[PDB]
Design a protein around this ligand. Structure first.
Ligand SMILES: O=C(CCl)N1CC2(C1)CN(S(=O)(=O)c1ccc(Br)cc1)CCO2
Ligand SMILES: O=C(CCl)N1CC2(C1)CN(S(=O)(=O)c1ccc(Br)cc1)CCO2
Ligand SMILES: [Ca+2]
Ligand SMILES: [Ca+2]
Ligand SMILES: [Cl-]
Ligand SMILES: [Cl-]
Ligand SMILES: [Mg+2]
Ligand SMILES: [Mg+2]
Ligand SMILES: [Mg+2]
Ligand SMILES: [Mg+2]
Ligand SMILES: [Mg+2]
Ligand SMILES: [Mg+2]
Lengths: 236, 9, 236, 9
């Protein structure tokens, strides 16, 4: 790996610099390098890893959607034949997207998840695993679409089981996991009722625990709760 | 429009 | 080159797709491929080339500025020593920026400029040459800062001489050239008075020629004229 | 703030 010669602390420092400069590809490479040093990650370091790859794959997903829409329009009746170029370029972006997902899932499997014993770290990583299988599912169309969906579901479910046992209902990681699992149900699994039910129960149980929080923790929890409400409004 | 998932903080 | 096997027309088609998807690195690679086919570029194709590389170098310039500012702050009195990392990462981004500039200047020199005989194409390419030497000058600090500045000035000057002979004062290429040359004077050459004088004369001569234009051409010319006015307001 | 140069059209 190209980052094998750089100190762990220097990689973390440069990831923070890359974030400030909005250089998310660099940020992701630095954090990949830091993970490959083999030490566990702190909370702050997990956040850097998450931000970097979310930004990279976010750009790819937005691009893929534009191209897929153009491709779908070309394959209607009345549409003029423009040759293989739209499909080719959509496939190019899709392959790069799948490569980023595979890289992240590879880091989780080798060996972040197996060393993660605390609830905060284990739930975060299993949520991430769910998320990146979900992004793979967004572009999947073949024999493995079903298996990819089940891989996402399985990761989210294991995360949910731990979070409900080990974390308060207002914990931001627990809340963010439930948000993303509800999105999985609505957008991927064709289960809008499961999505709505999860969003509602999550919201109500968090609401009832807000009284236990400080001002700062309250602000953190309520921000995510608003996103659950935004989805419920969109869905009902 | 698409559902909202967790943002970057 | 990786694009050597793709048809010219397919490269142009995919550049347009990449623009729609906001994939500017891909767009630039496709347009580089199209240039290397060896045929002259149309007006529309020159625009695709320009947009692609302007976006790529624009990101690098913004990143370089963030990092340079952090670096300058670290080298004050009272600032704690944080090691070589800020400088190293600024140098990394700087090197990549210089590489993009060198690529563009390479395309202009081999062989876009020498085959460009019409005013519109020749002025556009010489303006581009000025612009990319200007971006090199923004990060230059060594023995060649002066030579880089003179290279920019020389390209802009040749472009100006042709534009004044061959184009009306409202021509958008002529206007955009004068805008960028005025920025060169103010921001690079330490010549604010030359900058103001050029901006003012350009604006006034365009104003006096607006009556000759159609509605659509009027809209095009006045958009650039407003940018000259914006700079004059900033500068005076 | 920095001077404005020609934008993308
Ligand atoms: O381990 C700890 C402690 N971490 C990792 C985290 C802080 C949280 N995660 S997250 O769970 O995806 C998320 C994202 C946004 C919101 Br709003 C709420 C939750 C993102 C990365 O930073
Ligand atoms: O050759 C022709 C005809 N071209 C090339 C161009 C159309 C113009 N150039 S430009 O000169 O940099 C510029 C940019 C913005 C504005 Br507003 C005005 C002028 C950008 C690329 O598209
Ligand atoms: Ca452990
Ligand atoms: Ca010619
Ligand atoms: Cl392609
Ligand atoms: Cl570096
Ligand atoms: Mg070490
Ligand atoms: Mg037809
Ligand atoms: Mg495919
Ligand atoms: Mg051919
Ligand atoms: Mg001190
Ligand atoms: Mg250097």
């Amino acid at each position: 790996g190209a980052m094998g010669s750089m100190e762990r602390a220097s990689l973390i420092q440069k990831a923070k610099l890359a974030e400030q400069a909005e250089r998310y590809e660099d940020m992701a490479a630095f954090m990949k390098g830091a993970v490959e040093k083999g030490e566990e990650l702190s909370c702050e370091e997990r956040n850097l890893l998450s931000v970097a790859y979310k930004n990279v794959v976010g750009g790819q997903r937005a691009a893929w959607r534009v191209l897929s829409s153009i491709e779908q329009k070309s394959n209607e009746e009345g549409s003029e034949e423009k040759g293989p170029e739209v499909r080719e370029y959509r496939e190019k972006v899709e392959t790069e997207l799948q490569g980023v997902c595979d890289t992240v899932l590879g880091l989780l499997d080798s060996h972040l998840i197996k060393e993660a014993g605390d609830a905060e770290s284990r739930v975060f990583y299993l949520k991430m695993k769910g998320d990146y299988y979900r992004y793979l599912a967004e572009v999947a169309t073949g024999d493995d679409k079903k298996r990819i969906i089940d891989s996402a579901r399985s990761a989210y479910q294991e995360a949910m089981d731990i979070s409900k046992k080990e974390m308060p209902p207002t914990n931001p990681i627990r809340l963010g996991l439930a948000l993303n699992f509800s999105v999985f149900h609505y957008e991927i699994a064709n289960s809008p009722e499961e999505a709505i039910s999860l969003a509602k129960t999550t919201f109500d149980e968090a609401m009832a625990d807000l009284h236990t929080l400080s001002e700062d923790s309250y602000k953190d929890s309520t921000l995510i709760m608003q996103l659950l409400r935004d989805n419920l409004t969109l869905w009902t | 429009q698409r559902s909202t998932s967790t943002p970057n903080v």
